């Protein structure tokens, strides 16, 4: 059989049967008799298609497959795959390279050492020595992506190596099978939950890792068992515990001082999935306070090896949830009570405050809505406004490059057709991948857009206040008509300069049957 | 306290005594001071001193600590690397970096683009970006080097950093342990157990991460449970089973069509530590024949990936073989029997055959021996010819290149003071890393080298011959006196140019005090 | 024809016929049917292979061809391409990878990630897309080594592709001619000379691109017309001026500030075929004095942009050089007088003092003597004490990095058969190259090695004596007898103990018909 034969009954006995991708001449001979049992989504730039095949990834819980071309379409895709290694995303990013007979002179489209131009964003990085060895490779792909750690793999593919015939042993590769589901052997597992059962005051710290593996309801039960107070890990790319659980005590600040102050007086702290841990400002101080012991467990050897203190257990985490929660014993203090109700702040009849935003949202979207968060501003208030009751309802760029959450939307929207996707997306954000609306306008994928338009890159201001940095250029964003780019790329435009007519337009969105935007105009 | 004061201490917490090195001026201000209860380790080369650290770390099971001069330093020391990549093996090497106010102007003895220069060699490489951050730095490497899969990390420090102030909560970082001590989840584990009680007719085949992680014994009573013959896996770097126990079937012939010969009409093959396979000649075939399924048991993504063929599970081999012998059922099949003693070879009284060389080491030395091979045309001969019963007792360079076993042997020794360390050598071989000798005789550690001196690169010929390659140069190695190369380097000399001599002068060597060569001369 | 026949066809063409190796089963098909007008030079260990490649590049003024094995041959060699690197010295270092069928599943010698190894010590390295490609590969590295700035290249090239067929349109490359001798435009030129022309005191700085071009001549008359004091920049890899000339003031310290002083009074300071400047130990202070304007001549970008002072031109050496000497006025100034001749130091019946040897070989060798240096202590006194009035009179390795001299001593002595090749080397230094004696005593190459026997690394004493460090451990090298190895690799062995002894072992020596080695006893 040709190597183009070979290469997707391989993927269609892995159980890939979706390509995203942006495509060219040194692609044409992959993409040509493309099978029946396969669909290819199109986007118009590549940080577009890397983003989509992202929140289609995540919210799938398997891996996702992309085709690029060259350098060039490599490269504009860069930022992309920094957010998805952050996020331990299974990225199989696949990219057509020239024939072999025009490496060596560098025609126009070589990639021009190609394994090195995704470094250090990727797992594993190749480009095959020979055509007969592409399924091979490609396997190796598939199988580096999935096992734990996670995360996005490059390969790159001469295009005359298509029709080639493959290798006749390519056969035993259809059907391996490959596990990391692995967690603590029995004698150090048992002084685990020991420690855990004698602690007087423990408190859980949970990160992205817990919501990739679906072992919300494992944590659930743990911190119950325990009668502990549970945190989100700083920068939360994920949400991995029920927002209004009696337990939650919300989204941890990303300082060292702030966060050792919040561990103060816990004996054990258990953290989850989670890097220890995801700084962002820097707010100098003691990593832990005096009397605090932290144990770690994560799915990452890099995670383990970094953290500045605690103990680490590198496992699966689903795998660890579910044996913790089942053997800890079930303490007799009292549960913990749940966080206040966030205070309704004034709202007038002129523009919106993000607070009267997600209040509204929070009162109007379905129990299973998912929601996403490019408005680097208004973060905190999120949290605390938005009762997410399921896993997988919460997505916010993992390495914090902006143009994730536009695509990524409407990738997660095509893996959960049954749930409202809502991205919440910032004025400045909105524009890095604007050009991803066309694909749920052609592809008549539902999600609702909500772009919060203060007129200024919101968050930077605040960081500059901070620092006292005076005189600093390109701070405003002024003139950009989100109605007519909405318009431009075929997606449904309502506008929202008050509370009632937030209301109404959101009842519409709620309504429609294809993709809408709304563009909010805020404080 | 001193940036010097606190890397010292993390290195005592995390059980580190013993520096090998090579010194220069841009190590000068780590090396000072040194403390009283560390001792160094000096080698005259760099390639000498990394295999040295490298038998230390495979007979300790623990890891060893490096320190390089610079660029020049680090480069010599790159063919040892590669060694200790394939081996797993755990070593920290560091490297002085020039004075951080003349790395710009690439002065004498900078290390340009340091972290760059072992890649890819290294499972991690860093320079810190201050002073401040060696001591976290060095954790990380420690932590990098001995988590699962095990293996070698580089550090480049800039000279100046060593007398700078170190931040207080570097002490977070001396207690800190880190487990990956993991098995697969008891679900799936019992699905894995009822497929082994279920066959007909299993096979076994062990790798060198057995016994680096002393799995041996746990081995045995699985073999023993099945009634499974057992194979060591191809290009063997280590002995992970009694070689004389019924069950023993040898080391399989480094070739795809020669294994999946040995493996037919066996229709589960169970594989444990080892790479899916190392083969080495080229013997193009089938990876395994019809109605063979193989599952492999491995503590490295990478591994699992690039198999060809099977299913696979990633996770520790003492965990995952210490649950398998205890849970599966006394099978009702036949042990198998014991393979029968290998024949006799004719020897007048002349040059020694290898074989006469090998069975007069099994009827002379210690049950406890310990030896090293790097005599390339003798592998199959020696594995059939000694009686290994112990764990512990065999290495071979795991990437093929030679100028390890001569310095790991001296390691070994200093590693395992109460057993006979005996390296056999060959002629060619000898001399990648001579100036080796040097160590043992200062610091009498009393390994004994036995030189197979057939003046050729015999391996090599008999390539030449299976391909017909004819006319190649460079192929002898004639006009080397290696009594005159044991005396340069202050190692006692003694020779066996027949059968009589041989018997003689290894009786003295396994009565001396301090390091022995014997040259012996071969067929 | 074959990709082997081509290939030998185009290094013919280019003008190669020697290789440089150290032979293994990925190479036979390459050096199998070795050809009639090439010859093969062996060596037993990987970094005397390349520094005997390097000393006969940097000889002969020309490109030097080397073949090593896979990764483990190429790590080895690492050390030495630092120096390579530094010296800019036109080496072309193949080495052979696995067959392509098994690249994939890593078989025992493969090379991974191979283009990525050798890196930052290489101008170019490329592993090429098929067996085709090899010959269009192999002439891309020998015009990257041989375009200025000339350096070091790396070829990786997988066995089985030797016997395919090469492209006929490969014939093409066989006469290729690339031109880089070039010069500043007449113009700036003009610019440039009434600079010069109009200097009330001016100086000149002389670097090894200068010896590498032969220019040596040039800049002699260049001095003479603007009578003009000559220092060689610091850390010299070669020498460039006549030691004895009227203008020569020897060699400058490698220091920031000992520099600035020396360079005090002159106006304009004319620099050529150096990096401005090589420092070594740390000499903090002004980089030039208030007075002084310097002008840079390089061959290499990444030295001009480097540079923390001064003007500069990128241009050819040689091309410069010629141009400047024949365009600039004759002064009227008077021109400089003569340095003294150095005093001549107290001398007992015992050890000898570095400057009696000095002086000694200076009184005895022919005035066509070529020098080698890595006695790392006495370096401003060998200076100071050798007539050197011919071009390529003196190497020193350029990176620092030992195990050079020995191996390059051998290399230069086959390139300049008339001329008598002296490597004074120390103690320590002797042990890092050491089996590259072997190769001098098989090929018969004349080469005396003087061996500076003080029993320890004194430069680094030295170096920890100004730094006040104590209590560092490895800085005495006691217990070699040097005789003892020269026997070993089949080299003569004299002793000298005393300067009687001394006269007579070099007075024999020097009447010799094979290499040499005499192991000198000094203070
Ligand atoms: C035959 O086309 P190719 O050789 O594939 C292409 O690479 C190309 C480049 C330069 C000149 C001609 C074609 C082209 S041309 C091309 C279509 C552009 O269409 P457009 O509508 O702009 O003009 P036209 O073709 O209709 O006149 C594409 C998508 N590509 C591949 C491509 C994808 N993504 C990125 C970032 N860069 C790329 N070059
Ligand atoms: C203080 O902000 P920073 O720490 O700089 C930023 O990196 C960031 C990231 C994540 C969370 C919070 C801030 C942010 S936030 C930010 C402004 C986005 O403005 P937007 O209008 O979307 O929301 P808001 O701030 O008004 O609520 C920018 C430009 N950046 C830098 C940036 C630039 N270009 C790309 C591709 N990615 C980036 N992250
Ligand atoms: C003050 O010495 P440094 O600045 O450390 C050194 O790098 C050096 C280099 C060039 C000139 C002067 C010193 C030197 S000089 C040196 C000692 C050599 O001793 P040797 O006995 O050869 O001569 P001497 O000093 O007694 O006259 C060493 C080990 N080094 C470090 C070093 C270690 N390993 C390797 C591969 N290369 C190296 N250069
Ligand atoms: C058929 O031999 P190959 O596949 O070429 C070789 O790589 C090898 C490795 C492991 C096992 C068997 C052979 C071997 S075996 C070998 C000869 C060693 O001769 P020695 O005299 O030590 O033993 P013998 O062969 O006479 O019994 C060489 C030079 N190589 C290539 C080689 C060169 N330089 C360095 C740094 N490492 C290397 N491995
Ligand atoms: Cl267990
Ligand atoms: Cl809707
Ligand atoms: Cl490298
Ligand atoms: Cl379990
Ligand atoms: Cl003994
Ligand atoms: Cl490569
Ligand atoms: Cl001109
Ligand atoms: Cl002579
Ligand atoms: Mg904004
Ligand atoms: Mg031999
Ligand atoms: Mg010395």
Redesign the interface.
């Known amino acids: 059989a040709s190597v183009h034969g070979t290469t997707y009954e391989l993927l269609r006995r892995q159980g890939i049967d979706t390509v995203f991708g942006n495509p060219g001449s040194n692609e044409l001979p992959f993409l040509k008799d493309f099978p029946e049992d396969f669909r290819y989504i199109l986007a118009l730039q590549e940080a577009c298609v890397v983003g989509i095949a992202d929140g289609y990834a995540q919210a799938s819980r398997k891996p996702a497959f992309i085709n690029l071309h060259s350098a060039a379409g490599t490269g504009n895709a860069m930022g992309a795959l920094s957010n998805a290694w952050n996020s331990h995303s299974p990225l199989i990013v696949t990219a057509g390279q020239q024939t ?2 025009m ?3 560098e025609a126009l489209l070589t990639n021009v ?1 190609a ?2 131009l995704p470094r250090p964003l990727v797992k ?1 990085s190749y ?4 055509a ?2 592409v399924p ?2 490609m ?2 792909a598939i ?2 992506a999935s ?2 750690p996670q995360g996005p793999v490059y390969l790159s593919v ?1 295009y005359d190596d298509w029709d080639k015939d493959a ?1 006749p ?1 390519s056969h ?2 259809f059907d ?10 029995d004698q ?1 597992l048992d002084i685990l939950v020991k420690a855990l059962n004698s602690a007087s005051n423990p408190a859980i710290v949970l990160g992205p890792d817990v919501d990739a593996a679906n072992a919300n309801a494992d944590c659930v039960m743990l911190a119950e068992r325990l009668k502990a107070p549970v945190w989100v890990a700083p920068s939360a790319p994920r949400c991995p515990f029920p927002t209004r659980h009696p337990c939650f005590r919300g989204l941890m600040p990303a300082g060292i001082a702030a966060i050792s102050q919040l561990l103060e007086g816990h004996d054990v702290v258990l953290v989850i999935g989670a890097p220890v841990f995801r700084y962002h400002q820097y707010d100098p101080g ?3 306070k005096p009397g605090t012991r932290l144990i770690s467990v994560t799915c990452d ?2 995670e ?13 985490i689903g ?1 660890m949830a579910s044996a913790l929660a089942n053997l800890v014993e079930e303490s007799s203090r009292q549960l913990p009570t749940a966080a206040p109700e966030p205070a309704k702040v004034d709202q007038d009849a002129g523009r919106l405050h993000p607070e009267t935003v997600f209040d509204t949202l929070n009162d109007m979207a379905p129990e299973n809505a998912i929601y996403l968060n490019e408005s680097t501003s208004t973060t905190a208030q999120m949290w605390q406004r938005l009762n997410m009751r399921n896993p997988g309802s919460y997505y916010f760029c993992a390495a914090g490059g902006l143009g994730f959450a536009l695509p990524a939307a409407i990738g997660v929207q095509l893996a959960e057709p049954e749930r409202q996707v809502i991205a919440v997306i910032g004025d400045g954000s909105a524009n890095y991948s604007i050009s991803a609306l066309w694909t749920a306008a052609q592809y008549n994928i539902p999600t609702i857009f909500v772009i919060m338009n203060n007129g200024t890159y919101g968050a930077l201001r605040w960081f500059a206040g901070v620092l006292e940095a005076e005189n600093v250029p390109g701070l405003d964003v002024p003139g950009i008509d989100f109605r007519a780019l909405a318009k431009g790329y075929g997606v449904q435009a309502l506008k929202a300069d008050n509370l009632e007519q937030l209301k109404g337009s959101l009842q519409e969105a709620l309504s429609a049957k294809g993709p809408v935007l709304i563009e909010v105009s805020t404080v």
Chains 1, 2, 3 share one sequence.
């Open positions: 072999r007979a490496i060596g002179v050492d394994a090195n594993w480009e095959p020595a020979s007969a060895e091979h490779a396997s190796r199988h580096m096992m734990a001469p290798d042993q035993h590769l391996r099978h490959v596990s990391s589901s692995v967690r603590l052997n150090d003691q990593y832990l050897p890099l383990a090896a970094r953290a500045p203190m605690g103990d680490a257990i590198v496992a699966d795998a």
